[PDB]
Write a protein that binds this ligand. Structure first.
Ligand SMILES: Nc1ncnc2c1ncn2[C@@H]1O[C@H](COP(=O)(O)OP(=O)(O)OP(=O)(O)O)[C@@H](O)[C@H]1O
Ligand SMILES: [Cl-]
Ligand SMILES: [Mg+2]
Length: 318
């Protein structure tokens, strides 16, 4: 009544989602870099940068209006490349300057776990993560973690297939609920001590709920299922998918939270989450779920909005 699914959908369109016109501009930005590398590699077959793949929320259709960087993975092959993290990022930056000679050298900047290509206002910065590639199936290779620089063997193409499958199972709605949950998590990171919640983990948890039959066409109910899953399981239930391997193949782990990469059964996406992190997520999810329930039963629109502002902050006006 006061706030229902349509209210939430309109809020998402108004405040949460990256507008389609901007998403298209940014994807065309990444495609121009992709095409420049493909043309350089066509002329120089020995060049060690073999492929650029858009890998982040823009590629998945889950970007927020707050997006300020475009994610691409660059696949690196050959003996020249150092295995050390610092050396590899310096090596990648040097190769990028050679393939993109029109850029001023200072427009390519190594960071802690990635290399930035800065466009200086004429487009967003592109954040390039290396993948050491040696020809494993499905363009598997060792991706650099943006949490701790660990080398993680995985497949970005298969992750994008994984997300595509859930978006086809629930068109519009899966991506929308992911975006709403990401928007909530951004607010909680500012408000709750020790709160951390990686976007890929939010997507995997929501993909499990969709797989399990949760109806994503009602956004208040889908969010309540997400928050209630976190409170009831306390993030102690292992999340694993059978898209690419059977449950017999999952390696046992001693990690507190286990949300297993759908490509690689020994790669736990949640490996760095501590009990402190978990407790902050659980308290935040309990509070959000409680706010949505109270909002449903609130007698006035003003009270209903106040409760939803506990979930989505002051930008939510009803
Ligand atoms: N722990 C991991 N193991 C394997 N691959 C990962 C891991 N974390 C991230 N990735 C890969 O990096 C991609 C980007 O995930 P990330 O959590 O950075 O979110 P995003 O979709 O870019 O959202 P945003 O940057 O808006 O928070 C994932 O889709 C996946 O391919
Ligand atoms: Cl992105
Ligand atoms: Mg990203």
């Amino acid at each position: 009544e006061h706030v229902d699914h349509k209210t939430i959908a309109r809020f998402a369109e108004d405040k949460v989602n990256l507008p389609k016109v901007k998403a298209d501009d940014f994807r065309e930005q990444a495609k121009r870099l992709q095409n420049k590398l493909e043309g350089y590699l066509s002329d120089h077959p020995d060049f060690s940068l073999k492929r650029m793949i858009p890998s982040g929320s823009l590629a998945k259709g889950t970007a927020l209006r707050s997006l300020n960087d475009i994610d691409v993975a660059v696949y690196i092959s050959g003996s020249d490349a150092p295995q050390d993290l610092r050396g590899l990022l310096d090596y990648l930056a040097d190769r990028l300057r050679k393939a993109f000679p029109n850029f001023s050298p200072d427009q390519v900047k190594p960071q802690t776990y990635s290399v930035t290509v800065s466009f200086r206002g004429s487009g967003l910065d592109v954040d390039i993560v290396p993948v050491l590639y040696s020809g494993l199936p499905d363009w598997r290779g060792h991706l650099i973690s943006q949490e701790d620089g660990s080398f993680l063997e995985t497949s970005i193409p298969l992750h994008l297939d994984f997300i595509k499958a859930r978006k086809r199972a629930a068109p519009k709605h899966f991506a929308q609920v992911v975006r709403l949950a990401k928007y909530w998590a951004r607010l909680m990171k500012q408000e709750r001590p020790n709160f951390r919640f990686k976007s890929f983990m939010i997507e995997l948890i929501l993909a499990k709920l969709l797989d399990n039959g949760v109806d994503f066409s009602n956004y208040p109910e889908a969010l309540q299922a997400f928050f209630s899953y976190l409170v009831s399981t306390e993030l102690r239930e292992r999340i694993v998918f059978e898209d690419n391997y059977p449950a017999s193949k999952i390696g046992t782990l001693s990690d507190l939270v286990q949300i297993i990469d759908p490509v690689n059964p020994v790669n736990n996406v949640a490996r760095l989450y501590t009990q402190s992190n978990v407790d902050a997520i659980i308290d935040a999810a309990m509070d959000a779920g409680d706010a949505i329930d109270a909002a449903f039963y609130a007698p006035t629109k003003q009270l209903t909005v106040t409760y939803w502002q506990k979930v989505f902050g002051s930008s939510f006006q009803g």
